[PDB]
Write a protein that binds this ligand. Structure first.
Ligand SMILES: Nc1ncnc2c1ncn2[C@@H]1O[C@@H]2COP(=O)(O)O[C@H]2[C@H]1O
Length: 246
């Protein structure tokens, strides 16, 4: 398992949590020095448990699929909650079995579906460590509209920070003050599957992307990624989605 406590949290302790989260995801190889997530994991081993504590020390446990860093569902006290999608229904056979009741949320975990349920797109929802405190508090007691927003904060401050060093550093900048995600943050979230695919294809194409990827850089400017010498490949991306799952 991995844990993060908002009480006494600082940029350093958040960084240690994101390092713990990356290190809990299995890999058999690295592609251009980036861990390659597994094509498949059978049984309960597919799911990592993340224990998150708000400023007041109240806790949820979040189940994460270790093949793709997707959040499946979470446990709050004696109630489990799962996304309305087949991967999450399967997860509910293995995690949080001892919950008194299991609620299926009225949405999948897709960003587009969560944004419709929340009533706002990601670009308008402030993120940061205070926002994550609020999200844990929201998820402790069922409210499906509030939960959608809280889940968009939770996904970006955990899974997306695990995937990209830049996003980890953006949340560190928001340790004591929330701010809507940067243009580069949204670009990277949207591009993870595409970048993962092109980096794996670059093995066999001399490090050259078969299809260049258009991103937004840390200054808000267009950058076209053509090959593995790009900063996004050498420094930023931390995990690759296996091409078998694309
Ligand atoms: N259970 C989930 N199902 C689908 N997407 C999820 C889930 N949990 C978190 N996400 C995020 O929603 C996003 C939608 O497709 P993405 O390529 O952007 O990557 C995904 C994940 O980062």
């Amino acid at each position: 398992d991995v844990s993060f406590r908002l009480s006494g949290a600082d940029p350093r302790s958040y960084g240690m949590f994101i390092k713990d989260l990356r290190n809990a995801l299995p890999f058999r190889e690295k592609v251009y020095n980036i861990p390659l997530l597994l094509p498949s994991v059978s049984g309960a081993g597919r799911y990592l448990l993340m224990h998150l504590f708000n400023y007041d020390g109240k806790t949820i446990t979040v189940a994460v699929d270790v093949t793709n860093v997707y959040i499946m569902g979470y446990l709050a006290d004696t109630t489990s909650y799962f996304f309305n999608e087949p991967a999450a229904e399967l997860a509910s056979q293995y995690v949080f079995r001892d919950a008194r009741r299991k609620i299926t949320l009225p949405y999948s975990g897709n960003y587009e579906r969560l944004q419709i349920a929340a009533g706002k797109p990601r670009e308008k929802i402030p993120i940061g460590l205070p926002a994550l405190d609020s999200a844990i508090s929201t998820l402790l007691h069922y409210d499906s509209t509030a939960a959608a927003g809280a889940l968009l904060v939770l996904i970006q401050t955990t899974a997306e920070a695990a995937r990209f060093k830049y996003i980890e550093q953006q949340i560190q900048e928001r340790a004591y003050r929330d701010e809507v995600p940067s243009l580069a943050t949204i670009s990277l979230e949207n591009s993870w599957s595409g970048l993962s695919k092109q980096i794996q294809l670059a093995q066999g194409n001399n490090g050259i992307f078969r299809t260049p990827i258009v991103l937004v850089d840390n200054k808000g400017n267009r950058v076209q990624i053509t090959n593995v010498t790009s900063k996004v490949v050498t420094s930023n991306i931390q995990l690759l989605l296996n091409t078998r799952n694309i």
